[PDB]
Write a protein that binds this ligand. Structure first.
Ligand code: ALF
Ligand SMILES: [Mg+2]
Length: 1091
């Protein structure tokens, strides 16, 4: 039959529409209408009411669900030539199900049946008879022969236009009405308009009118808040610009929309506020890209061509062959034209030839944007907790409605008009805005965050950030600034009477300064700029070299130097070498970590082992410099064969100004903060000890000797204590090691301890991991998740992008300057800082440099959680109080007026306005809020406060019935007339709702006290003053204007004392339950102790 093969879909069945007669909501109902018309030709109007209600509900039901829609409207078919829709069942982790429309169109004499799901195309492959997404050639492993030989699209290419589609993000913003039409059918809005219809049937005109106005206003606000996000996602797509495209064996200038895979383009310097069109691959030339978006890093990489690789043999690896790929969405700082001639002519502009590989949403950035927009997960996915919470209130509602019905039957009330009061109560218990609470809280939190330049991409991670047990920090770029001072050269003294004897500058032998000048990766752009590693710039400026436009770097007052050919720098065998030439002869330079350089050169100074350990133990970060004279294009293992030492390079990387305070706050706020770095263990331990992650002594796990026999040693920064350990037999001693030393683990000892029984006993008591590879950070975060701890990681570069994506909440600190943002905002204003500039490296993205982003995110998540809790409690209590007051008043005849109900509504909306506003404390607290609706705190507090309120209500009702008696009459009508019961019940309801507002407000440990903020304090005092002036008859005209019967002087005392004691009882109960059951206990990892 018909299927769809794709990782998104799970199953699908074809559909075809049904005529209007056969639908379930037209034909089966005519017999019922006819039966009503026959039986009619009092008590029968309710029959017609419920009939029309069931009809409208069955008519609306297809819009709530999708399976119901496909079962009502469409009939499943198994012939692909007749269907006009298809129902797509999604996989459990990609978006939600949906119905999509099959389209047909003929091309070149053969029609092609297709549709489009989640902006991911499909087509109809006849020979397989299954809808299959387009598969690009670069996905499966190609031989680079066909990539080198490609010469652009020729002839008519409409089929490719249909298969791959245009190259542009397709994010449509719907008109306001076309979106309000989709919100007006949701179950919640339908229920609210149903309630308003009931209140109209009960002859409440002004009240229902005001309520309907409020409903419409809230829905329009929600639609605007939903449209602004779509308007924010659209800025990631660039604006099209013209690049020359090779088609039909000649250069014709096409725009960027009209690009297909395997199409030759010519890329140039990227324009302002633009990027690379699509995922290209260099075919000839050279470029220097700035992979800011995908990698969250600033240092410009250097991309190289593909022509040099052998054609028939090798395979396109995207491993070693990664210096040729150019992603989509990164800037290109400088591009150089091809050197030699080729079979194809040179482009007219100064650009380099490149081949397209992926277009549209299927590029690297495009796939992430699609998953971000369409297949995103909403907050509070379960929703069963909220539904059960609403059902509990409805149980209470039925418990009250039964008594209302029994007493209404007793007092001779008309049943036909009593069923409506039962329905009013049962529908008044239900609060409509309950499930959409966390979403509004999260939106407010996101705005308050974006005020700090901390832009977020996936917003369902905010409730995760409240209760965090472990925080992981990368060292270089996160806890340590980029700017680094230069202390001086060391170890050049051949005599070396002193170990810590440094040579500053202008005193080293000329060989050393030549080596420090020749071996660098800087380049001077044509316009005039220096782009490269900031460390090399600092070193090269401090020594006194200067880089020129051509590769020569000279004018240092000591000669002229030019760089002939250089070698790249790789993490494996980390070192960099380059070949240079001076006026006299030719030599070579090399600069890498001192360990690897040691095993390279022949002449080994007697104290080489001691010097770099003496300089690395205390803060500094050393590198080695070695050279060799070379007499007059060859391999790398020859230039690095034998070398001669020339000194060290000793840098002091200082901490960020905001690191110590952030780590101190996180340590005091019941969080455990650990370090995961890539530097050698001694520097990691020193920085961790200076910041405040380790306190006491520290032990290190490393290899014992040069033998790789997998035997570790517990060593110390000073070699005083050395405890041997063996992974095969020995097991960690708890009180001998972990209770004294706060140990730190290396990447090698972590790799050798795999499979141990005590790996998960060691991963609790260590706080510093050093020399870990980019793949082991993923393993560490996966294990810290598996143990049951929620995690956080904040890292800058590409060493830790996998870790950032694995952690529960990930932050990427994009190092920037405040004055740079000021200049950018000023230029934008003359022409805020939209999300478009933020990267796609992690969920969150701090646009500034300082580390306070972690604290800020934690604070906002915590406040969102606690605000949700208080809103749950307040809504439930107000609803229950209102329902039981309505029941007490409806048992007898009397009912509220119109103005009384409207005034109550306005006086409570006054408090609803203020209560949302709150300010968080600057310091975090040890008490973290727990997640969930069902727990002892919420249910206990709600139930007990409600017990107090019902006690008060029963007491005053007994008193009122004692003062004036009501007798059961025949054929009553619930009419409004000023009496004592109406007054008593109205004042009590209005006072007790305000009392719950004032009692269930969240206090000091999480936010600012109620007394502090005035917009709520003064509102509550105003409403209390009005209610108490009403209850005490301070103004007779005020009571007369609202039709309040004069109360006997003895009754005022009971009423006022009753309310004033109700408030105190409620306050005491809630304070008790809060002080006992509020905050959950922190984990077994975030405790502070050492002997
Ligand atoms: F210096 Al790193 F991960 F950025 F070890
Ligand atoms: Mg880093």
């Amino acid at each position: 039959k018909s299927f769809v093969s794709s990782p998104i879909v799970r199953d699908s069945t074809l559909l075809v529409p049904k005529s209007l007669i056969a639908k379930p909501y037209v034909l089966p109902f005519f017999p019922l209408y006819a039966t009503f018309a026959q039986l009619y030709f009092e008590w029968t109007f309710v029959y017609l009411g419920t009939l029309v209600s069931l009809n409208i509900l069955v008519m609306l039901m297809p819009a709530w669900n999708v399976k119901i829609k496909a079962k009502f409207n469409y009939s499943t078919t198994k012939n692909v030539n007749e269907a006009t829709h298809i129902l797509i069942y999604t996989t459990p982790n990609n978006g939600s199900d949906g119905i999509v429309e099959i389209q047909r169109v003929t091309e070149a004499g053969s029609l092609q049946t297709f549709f489009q799901f989640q902006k991911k195309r499909f087509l109809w492959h006849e020979n397989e008879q299954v809808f299959s997404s387009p598969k690009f050639l670069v996905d499966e492993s190609p031989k680079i022969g066909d990539f080198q030989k490609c010469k652009g699209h020729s002839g008519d290419l409409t089929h490719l236009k249909r298969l791959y589609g245009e190259n542009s993000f397709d994010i449509p913003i719907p008109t306001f009405m076309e979106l309000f039409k989709e919100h007006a059918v949701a179950p919640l809005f339908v229920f609210q308009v149903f309630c308003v219809a009931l209140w109209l049937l009960d002859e409440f005109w002004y009240y229902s009118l005001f309520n309907l106005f409020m409903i419409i206003s809230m829905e329009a606000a929600a639609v605007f808040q939903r449209l602004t996000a779509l308007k924010e996602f659209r800025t990631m797509g660039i604006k099209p610009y013209t690049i020359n495209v090779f088609r039909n064996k000649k250069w014709v200038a096409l725009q960027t929309n009209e690009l297909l895979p395997m199409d030759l383009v010519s890329i140039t310097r990227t324009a302002e506020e633009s990027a690379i069109p699509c995922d290209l691959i260099l075919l000839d030339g050279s470029a220097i890209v700035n992979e800011a978006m995908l990698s969250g890093e600033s240092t410009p990489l250097l991309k190289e061509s593909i022509k040099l690789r052998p054609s028939e043999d090798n395979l396109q690896l995207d491993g070693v062959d990664k210096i040729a790929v150019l992603h989509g969405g990164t800037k290109a700082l400088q591009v150089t034209p091809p050197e030699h001639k080729s079979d194809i002519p040179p482009p007219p502009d100064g650009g380099a030839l490149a081949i397209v590989t992926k277009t549209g949403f299927e590029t690297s950035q495009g796939s992430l944007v699609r998953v971000m927009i369409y297949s995103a997960e909403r907050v509070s996915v379960d929703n069963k907790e909220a539904l059960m919470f609403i059902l509990f209130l409805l149980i209470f509602a039925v418990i009250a409605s039964w008594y209302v019905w029994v007493e209404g039957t007793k007092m001779g009330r008309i049943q036909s008009k009593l069923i409506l009061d039962c329905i009013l109560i049962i529908t008044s218990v239900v609060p409509p805005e309950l499930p959409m609470e966390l979403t509004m809280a999260v939106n407010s939190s996101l705005a308050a965050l974006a005020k700090f330049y901390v832009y977020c991409t996936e917003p369902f991670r905010i409730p995760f950030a409240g209760r965090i047990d472990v925080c992981c920090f990368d060292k270089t770029g996160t806890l340590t600034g980029e700017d680094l001072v230069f202390e001086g050269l060391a170890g050049i003294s051949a005599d070396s009477e002193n170990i810590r004897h440094l040579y500053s500058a202008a005193e080293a032998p000329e060989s050393t300064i030549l080596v420090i000048g020749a071996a660098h990766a800087l380049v001077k752009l044509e316009d005039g700029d220096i782009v490269g590693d900031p460390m090399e710039k600092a070193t090269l400026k401090a020594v006194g070299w200067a880089v020129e436009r051509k590769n020569s770097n000279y004018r240092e007052g000591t000669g002229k130097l030019d760089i002939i050919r250089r070698f790249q720098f790789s993490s494996a065998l980390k070192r960099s070498a380059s070949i240079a030439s001076h006026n006299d002869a030719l030599f070579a330079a090399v600069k890498g970590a001192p360990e690897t350089i040691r095993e390279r050169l022949s002449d080994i100074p007697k104290n080489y082992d001691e010097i770099y350990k003496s300089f690395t133990r205390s803060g500094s970060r050393v590198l080695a410099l070695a050279s060799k004279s070379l007499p007059k294009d060859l391999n790398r293992d020859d230039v690095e064969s034998e070398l001669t030492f020339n000194g060290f390079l000793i840098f002091h990387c200082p901490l960020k100004d905001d690191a110590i305070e952030t780590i101190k706050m996180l340590n005091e706020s019941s969080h455990r903060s650990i370090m995961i770095t890539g530097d050698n263990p001694l520097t990691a331990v020193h920085v961790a000890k200076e910041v405040g992650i380790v306190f006491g002594e520290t032990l290190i796990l490393d290899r014992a000797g040069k033998s790789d026999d997998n035997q570790l040693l517990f060593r110390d920064v000073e070699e005083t204590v050395s405890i041997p350990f063996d992974p095969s037999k020995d097991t960690f001693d708890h009180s001998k090691l972990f209770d004294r030393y706060d140990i730190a683990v290396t990447g090698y000892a972590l790799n050798a301890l795999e499979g141990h029984s005590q790996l998960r006993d060691l991963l609790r008591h260590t706080w510093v991991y050093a020399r870990v590879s980019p793949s082991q950070k993923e393993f560490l975060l996966n294990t810290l998740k598996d143990m049951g701890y929620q995690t956080l990681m904040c890292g800058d570069g590409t060493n830790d992008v996998g870790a950032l994506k694995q952690a529960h909440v990930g932050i990427a600190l994009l190092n920037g300057t405040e004055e740079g943002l000021k200049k950018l905002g000023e230029q934008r204003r003359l022409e805020a800082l939209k999300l478009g500039d933020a990267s796609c490296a992690a969920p969150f993205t701090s646009k500034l440099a300082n580390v306070s982003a972690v604290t800020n995110i934690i604070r906002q998540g915590r406040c969102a959680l606690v605000n949700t809790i208080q809103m749950y409690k307040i809504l439930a209590l107000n609803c229950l109080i209102s329902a039981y007051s309505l029941s007490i008043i409806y048992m007898a005849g009397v009912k509220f007026g119109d103005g009384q109900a409207t005034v109550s509504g306005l006086l409570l909306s006054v408090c609803f306005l203020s209560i949302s506003r709150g300010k968080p404390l600057e310091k975090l607290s040890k008490q973290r809020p727990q997640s969930g609706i069902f727990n002892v705190y919420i249910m206990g507090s709600i139930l007990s406060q409600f017990a107090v309120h019902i006690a008060t209500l029963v007491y005053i009702t007994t008193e009122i019935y004692k003062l004036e008696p009501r007798e059961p009459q025949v054929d009553l009508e619930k009419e409004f007339a000023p009496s004592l019961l109406n007054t008593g019940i109205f004042i009590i309801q209005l006072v007790q709702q305000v009392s719950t507002f004032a009692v269930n407000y969240q206090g000091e440990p999480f936010r600012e006290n109620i007394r502090s903020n005035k917009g709520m304090y003064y509102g509550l005092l105003g409403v209390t003053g009005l209610a108490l002036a009403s209850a005490t008859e301070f103004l007779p005209e005020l009571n007369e204007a609202m039709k309040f019967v004069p109360m006997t002087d003895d009754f005022k005392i009971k009423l006022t004392l009753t309310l004033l004691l109700d408030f105190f009882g409620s306050w005491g109960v809630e304070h008790f339950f809060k002080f006992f059951f509020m905050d959950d206990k922190p984990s077994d990892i975030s405790v502070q102790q050492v002997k």
